[PDB]
Short mmCIF file of C-alpha atoms and ligand atoms in Angstrom, two decimals:
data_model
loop_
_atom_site.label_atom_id
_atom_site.label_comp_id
_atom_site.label_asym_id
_atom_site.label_seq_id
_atom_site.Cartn_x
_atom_site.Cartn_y
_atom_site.Cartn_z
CA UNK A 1 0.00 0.00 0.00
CA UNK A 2 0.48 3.72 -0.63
CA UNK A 3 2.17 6.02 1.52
CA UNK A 4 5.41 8.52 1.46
CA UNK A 5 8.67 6.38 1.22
CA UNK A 6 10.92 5.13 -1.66
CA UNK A 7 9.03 2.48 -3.01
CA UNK A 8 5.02 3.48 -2.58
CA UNK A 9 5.42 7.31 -2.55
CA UNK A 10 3.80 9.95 -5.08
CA UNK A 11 4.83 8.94 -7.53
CA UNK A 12 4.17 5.53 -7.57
CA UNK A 13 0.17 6.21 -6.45
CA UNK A 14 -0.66 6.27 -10.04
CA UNK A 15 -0.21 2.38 -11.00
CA UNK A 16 -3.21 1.75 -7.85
CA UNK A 17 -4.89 5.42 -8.41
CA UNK A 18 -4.83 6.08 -12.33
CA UNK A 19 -6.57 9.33 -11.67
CA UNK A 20 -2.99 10.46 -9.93
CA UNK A 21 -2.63 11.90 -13.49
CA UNK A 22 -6.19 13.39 -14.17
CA UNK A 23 -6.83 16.19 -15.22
CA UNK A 24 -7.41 18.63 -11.77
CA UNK A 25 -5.01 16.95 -9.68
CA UNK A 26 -3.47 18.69 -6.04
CA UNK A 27 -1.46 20.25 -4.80
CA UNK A 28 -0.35 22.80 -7.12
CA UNK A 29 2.48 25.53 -7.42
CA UNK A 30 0.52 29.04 -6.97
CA UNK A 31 2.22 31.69 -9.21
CA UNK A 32 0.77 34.51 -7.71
CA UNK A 33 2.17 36.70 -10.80
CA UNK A 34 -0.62 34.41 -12.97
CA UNK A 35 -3.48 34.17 -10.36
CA UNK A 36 -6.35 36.31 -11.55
CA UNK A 37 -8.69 38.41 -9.25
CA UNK A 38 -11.42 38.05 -9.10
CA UNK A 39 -13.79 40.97 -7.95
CA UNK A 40 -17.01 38.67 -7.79
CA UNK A 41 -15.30 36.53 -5.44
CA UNK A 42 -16.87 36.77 -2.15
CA UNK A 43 -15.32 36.73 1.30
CA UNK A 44 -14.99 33.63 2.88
CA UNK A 45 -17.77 32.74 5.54
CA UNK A 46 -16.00 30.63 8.86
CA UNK A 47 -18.15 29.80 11.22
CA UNK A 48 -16.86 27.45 13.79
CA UNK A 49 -17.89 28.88 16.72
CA UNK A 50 -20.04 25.75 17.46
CA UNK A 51 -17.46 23.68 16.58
CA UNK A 52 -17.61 20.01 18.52
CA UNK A 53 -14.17 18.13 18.15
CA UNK A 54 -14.35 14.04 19.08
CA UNK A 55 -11.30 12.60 18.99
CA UNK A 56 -7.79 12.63 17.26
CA UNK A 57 -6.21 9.75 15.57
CA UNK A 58 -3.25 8.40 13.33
CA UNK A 59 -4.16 6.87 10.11
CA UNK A 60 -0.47 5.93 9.42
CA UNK A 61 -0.34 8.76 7.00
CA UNK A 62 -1.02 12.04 9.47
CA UNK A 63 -3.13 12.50 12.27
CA UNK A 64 -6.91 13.93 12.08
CA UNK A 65 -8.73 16.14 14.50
CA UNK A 66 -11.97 15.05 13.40
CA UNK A 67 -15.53 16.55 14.14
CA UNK A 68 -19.30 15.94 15.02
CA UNK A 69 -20.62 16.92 10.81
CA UNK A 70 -24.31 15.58 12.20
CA UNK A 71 -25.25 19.28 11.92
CA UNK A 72 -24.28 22.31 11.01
CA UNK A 73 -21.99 23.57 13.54
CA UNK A 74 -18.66 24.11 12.32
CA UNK A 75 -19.36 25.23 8.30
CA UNK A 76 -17.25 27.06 5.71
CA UNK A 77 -19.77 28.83 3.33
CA UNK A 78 -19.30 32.26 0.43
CA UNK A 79 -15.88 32.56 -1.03
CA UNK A 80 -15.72 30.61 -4.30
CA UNK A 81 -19.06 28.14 -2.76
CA UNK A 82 -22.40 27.67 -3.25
CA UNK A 83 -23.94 26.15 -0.53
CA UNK A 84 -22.40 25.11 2.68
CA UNK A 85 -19.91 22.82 3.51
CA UNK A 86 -19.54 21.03 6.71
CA UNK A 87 -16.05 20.72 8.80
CA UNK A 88 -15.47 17.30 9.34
CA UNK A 89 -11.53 17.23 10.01
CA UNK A 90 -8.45 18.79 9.60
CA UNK A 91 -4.85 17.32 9.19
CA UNK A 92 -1.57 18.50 8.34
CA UNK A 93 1.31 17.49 6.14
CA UNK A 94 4.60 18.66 6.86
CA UNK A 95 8.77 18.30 6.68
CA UNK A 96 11.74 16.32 7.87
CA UNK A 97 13.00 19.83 7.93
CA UNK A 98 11.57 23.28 8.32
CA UNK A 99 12.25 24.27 4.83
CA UNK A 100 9.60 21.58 3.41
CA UNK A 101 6.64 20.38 4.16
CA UNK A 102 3.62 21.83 2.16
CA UNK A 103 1.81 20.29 -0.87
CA UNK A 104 0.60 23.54 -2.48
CA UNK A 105 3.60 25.98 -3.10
CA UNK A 106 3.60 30.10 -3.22
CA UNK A 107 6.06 31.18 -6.57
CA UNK A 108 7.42 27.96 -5.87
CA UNK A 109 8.27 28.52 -2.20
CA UNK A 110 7.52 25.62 0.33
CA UNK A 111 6.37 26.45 3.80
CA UNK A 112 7.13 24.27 6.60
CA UNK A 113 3.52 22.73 6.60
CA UNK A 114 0.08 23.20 5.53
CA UNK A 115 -3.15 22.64 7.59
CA UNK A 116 -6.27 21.18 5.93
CA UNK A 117 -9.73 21.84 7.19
CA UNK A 118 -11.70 19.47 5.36
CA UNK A 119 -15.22 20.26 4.29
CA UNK A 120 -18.59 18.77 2.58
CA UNK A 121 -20.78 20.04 0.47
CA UNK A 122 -24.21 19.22 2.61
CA UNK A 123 -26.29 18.67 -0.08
CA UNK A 124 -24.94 15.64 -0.42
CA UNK A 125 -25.84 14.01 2.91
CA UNK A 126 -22.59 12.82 3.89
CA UNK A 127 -18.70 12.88 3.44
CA UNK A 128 -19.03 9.62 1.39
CA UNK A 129 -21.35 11.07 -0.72
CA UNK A 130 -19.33 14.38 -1.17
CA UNK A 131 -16.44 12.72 -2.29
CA UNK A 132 -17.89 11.32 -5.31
CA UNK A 133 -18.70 14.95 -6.56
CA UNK A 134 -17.07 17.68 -8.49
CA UNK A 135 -18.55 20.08 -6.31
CA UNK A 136 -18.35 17.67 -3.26
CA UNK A 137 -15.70 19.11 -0.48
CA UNK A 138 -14.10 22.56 0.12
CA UNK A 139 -10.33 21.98 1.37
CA UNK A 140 -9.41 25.17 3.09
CA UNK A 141 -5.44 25.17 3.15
CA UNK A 142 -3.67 27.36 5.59
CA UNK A 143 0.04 27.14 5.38
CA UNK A 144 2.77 27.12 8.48
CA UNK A 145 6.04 28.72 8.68
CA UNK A 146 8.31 28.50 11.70
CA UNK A 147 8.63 31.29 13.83
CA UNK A 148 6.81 32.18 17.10
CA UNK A 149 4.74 29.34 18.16
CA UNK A 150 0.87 29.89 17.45
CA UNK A 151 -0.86 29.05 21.11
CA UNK A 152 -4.10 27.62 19.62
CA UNK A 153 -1.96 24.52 18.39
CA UNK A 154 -0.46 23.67 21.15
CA UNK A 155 -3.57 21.69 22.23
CA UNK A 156 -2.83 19.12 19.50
CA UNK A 157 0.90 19.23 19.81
CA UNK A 158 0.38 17.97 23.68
CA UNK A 159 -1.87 15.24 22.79
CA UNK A 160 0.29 13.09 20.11
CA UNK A 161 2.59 11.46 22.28
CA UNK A 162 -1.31 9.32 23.08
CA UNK A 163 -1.27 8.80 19.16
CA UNK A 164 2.38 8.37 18.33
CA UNK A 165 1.46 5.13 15.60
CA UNK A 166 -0.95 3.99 13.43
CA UNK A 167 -4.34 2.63 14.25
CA UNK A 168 -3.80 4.79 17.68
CA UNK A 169 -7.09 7.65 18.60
CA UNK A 170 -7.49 9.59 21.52
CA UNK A 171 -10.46 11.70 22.75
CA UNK A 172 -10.25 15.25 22.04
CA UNK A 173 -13.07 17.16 23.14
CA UNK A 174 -13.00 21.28 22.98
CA UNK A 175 -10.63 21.64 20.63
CA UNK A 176 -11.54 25.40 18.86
CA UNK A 177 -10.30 25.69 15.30
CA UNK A 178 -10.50 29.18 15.61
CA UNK A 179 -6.99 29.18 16.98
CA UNK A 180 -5.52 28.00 13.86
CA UNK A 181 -6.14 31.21 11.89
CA UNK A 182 -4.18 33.85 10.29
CA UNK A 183 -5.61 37.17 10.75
CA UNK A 184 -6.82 37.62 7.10
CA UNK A 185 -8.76 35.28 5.05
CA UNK A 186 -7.57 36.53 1.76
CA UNK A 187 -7.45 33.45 -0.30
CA UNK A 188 -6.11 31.92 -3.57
CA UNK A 189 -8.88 29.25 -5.06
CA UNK A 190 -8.87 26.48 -7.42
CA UNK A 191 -10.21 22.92 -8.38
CA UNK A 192 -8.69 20.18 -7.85
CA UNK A 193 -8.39 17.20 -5.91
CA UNK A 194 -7.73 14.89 -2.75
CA UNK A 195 -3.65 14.95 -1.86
CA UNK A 196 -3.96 11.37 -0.98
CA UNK A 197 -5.53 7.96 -2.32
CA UNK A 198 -7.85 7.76 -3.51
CA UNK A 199 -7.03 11.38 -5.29
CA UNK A 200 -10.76 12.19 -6.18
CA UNK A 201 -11.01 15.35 -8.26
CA UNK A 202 -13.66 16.70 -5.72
CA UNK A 203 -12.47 19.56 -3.87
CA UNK A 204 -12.36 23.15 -4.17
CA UNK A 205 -9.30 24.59 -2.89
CA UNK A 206 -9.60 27.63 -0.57
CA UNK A 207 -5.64 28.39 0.80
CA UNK A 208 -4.99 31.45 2.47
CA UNK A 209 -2.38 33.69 1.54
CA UNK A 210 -1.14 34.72 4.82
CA UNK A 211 0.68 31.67 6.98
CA UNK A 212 0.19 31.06 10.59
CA UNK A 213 3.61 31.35 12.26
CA UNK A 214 4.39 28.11 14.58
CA UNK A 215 7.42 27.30 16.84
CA UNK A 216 10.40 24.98 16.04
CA UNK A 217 9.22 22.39 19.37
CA UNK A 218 5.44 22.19 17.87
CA UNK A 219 6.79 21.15 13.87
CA UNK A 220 9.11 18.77 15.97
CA UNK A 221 6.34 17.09 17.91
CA UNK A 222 5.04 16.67 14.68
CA UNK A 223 7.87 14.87 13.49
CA UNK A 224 8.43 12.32 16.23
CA UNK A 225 4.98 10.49 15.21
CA UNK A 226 5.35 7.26 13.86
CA UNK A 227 3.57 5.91 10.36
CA UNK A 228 4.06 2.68 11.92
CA UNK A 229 2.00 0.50 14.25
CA UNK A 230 3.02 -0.04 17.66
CA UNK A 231 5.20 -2.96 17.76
CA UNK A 232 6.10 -2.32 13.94
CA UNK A 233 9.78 -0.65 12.83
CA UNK A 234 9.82 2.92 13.28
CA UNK A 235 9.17 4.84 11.07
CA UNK A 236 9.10 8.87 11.34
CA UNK A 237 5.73 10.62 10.21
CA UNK A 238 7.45 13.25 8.58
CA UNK A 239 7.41 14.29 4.45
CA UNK A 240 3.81 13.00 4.01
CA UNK A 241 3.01 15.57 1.70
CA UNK A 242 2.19 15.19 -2.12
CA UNK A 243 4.39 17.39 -4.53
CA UNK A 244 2.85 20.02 -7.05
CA UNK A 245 0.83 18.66 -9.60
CA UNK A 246 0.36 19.95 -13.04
CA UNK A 247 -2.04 23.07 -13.47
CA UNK A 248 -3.29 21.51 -16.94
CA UNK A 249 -6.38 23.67 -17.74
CA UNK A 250 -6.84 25.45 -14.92
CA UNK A 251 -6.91 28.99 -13.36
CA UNK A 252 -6.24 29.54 -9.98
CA UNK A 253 -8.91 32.99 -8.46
CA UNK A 254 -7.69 35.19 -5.99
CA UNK A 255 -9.66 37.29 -3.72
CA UNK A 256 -7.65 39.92 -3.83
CA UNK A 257 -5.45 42.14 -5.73
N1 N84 B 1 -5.08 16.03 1.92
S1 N84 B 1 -6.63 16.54 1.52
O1 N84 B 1 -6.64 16.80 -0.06
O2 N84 B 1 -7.07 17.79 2.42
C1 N84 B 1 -7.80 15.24 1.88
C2 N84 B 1 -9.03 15.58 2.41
C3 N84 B 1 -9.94 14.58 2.69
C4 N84 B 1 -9.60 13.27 2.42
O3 N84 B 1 -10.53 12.28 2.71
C5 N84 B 1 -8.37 12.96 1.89
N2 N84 B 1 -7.91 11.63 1.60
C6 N84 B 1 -8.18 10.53 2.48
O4 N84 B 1 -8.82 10.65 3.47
N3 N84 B 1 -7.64 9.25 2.08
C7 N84 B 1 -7.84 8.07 2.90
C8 N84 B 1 -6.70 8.03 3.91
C9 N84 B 1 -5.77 9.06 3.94
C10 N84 B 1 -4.75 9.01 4.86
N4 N84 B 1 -4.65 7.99 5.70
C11 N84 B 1 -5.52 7.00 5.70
C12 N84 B 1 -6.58 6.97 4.81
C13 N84 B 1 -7.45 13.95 1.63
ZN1 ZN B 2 -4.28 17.15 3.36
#
């Protein structure tokens, strides 16, 4: 199976995940010299205030924060969208080192790593659903540079050492997502696609153009997870993200000029 190392990573999905070479395929590089704005874009619409986080768990691939999407209490809506779109997790990706670790790229730059808040489209019903639809999640991407640490992660930082390897989850109740934002929500916006198996060209990317600043000691908790089981050769979680992808036929929107 699929995952980040020599002999199943990137770009080997494509032999069990054809679509790997579609046609709207993410991450991308965003030339922000090329980006068009867009005056009929609207501002983006977060409303998490009512968010209700479970539980966190490693998948062997990151860890997710994952939410109660049984109503709408956490939902990303305007911007690019029609509709509403329901959080439902986020996750990160992110470097062996501080100079790498995001999937989409700024003018080629890579950030240390990039937070996904993951997002349905709720007239489908359900994630499942959403995922088999053009129009089907919103990804918002926020990326991380290192710097001064950014409080309203340190939350998750504490709690991995309960979730250092795969298979392992861990209640995590309270959690606000609010803390994980930049001050401005300008955005860049495309279409394009899940980062990981199975790659489904069902998301419309939202990624902010100004990074949240985190410390060196939170990107190294990050790095001492395992993609490993317990009991299973170690393995560090680190460099699970997905290089940029062709543009092919596609413009990426920003909200501002
Ligand atoms: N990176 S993303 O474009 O924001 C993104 C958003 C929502 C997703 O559902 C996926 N992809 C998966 O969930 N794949 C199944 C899986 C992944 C990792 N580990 C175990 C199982 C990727
Ligand atoms: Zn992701």
């Amino acid at each position: 199976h699929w995952g980040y190392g020599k002999h199943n990573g990137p770009e080997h999905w494509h032999k069990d995940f054809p679509i790997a070479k579609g046609e709207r395929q993410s991450p991308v590089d965003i030339d922000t010299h090329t980006a068009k704005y867009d005056p009929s874009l609207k501002p983006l619409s977060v409303s998490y205030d009512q968010a209700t986080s479970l539980r966190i768990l490693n998948n062997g691939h990151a860890f997710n924060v994952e939410f109660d999407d049984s109503q709408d209490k956490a939902v990303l809506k305007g911007g690019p969208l029609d509709g509403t779109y329901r959080l439902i997790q986020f996750h990160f990706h992110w470097g062996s080192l501080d100079g790498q670790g995001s999937e989409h790229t700024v003018d080629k730059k890579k950030y240390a790593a990039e937070l996904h808040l993951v997002h349905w489209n709720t007239k489908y019903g359900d994630f499942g659903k959403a995922v088999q639809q053009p129009d089907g999640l919103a990804v918002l991407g926020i990326f991380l540079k290192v710097g001064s640490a950014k409080p309203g992660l340190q939350k998750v930082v504490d709690v991995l050492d309960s979730i250092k390897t795969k298979g392992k989850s861990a209640d995590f109740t309270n959690f606000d997502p609010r803390g994980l934002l930049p001050e401005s929500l300008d955005y860049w916006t495309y279409p394009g696609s899940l980062t990981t198996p199975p790659l489904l060209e069902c998301v419309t990317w939202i990624v902010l153009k100004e990074p949240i600043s985190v410390s060196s000691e939170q990107v190294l908790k990050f790095r001492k997870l395992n993609f490993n089981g317990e009991g299973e050769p170690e393995e560090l979680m680190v460099d699970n993200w997905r290089p940029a992808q062709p543009l092919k036929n596609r413009q990426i929107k920003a909200s501002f000029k």
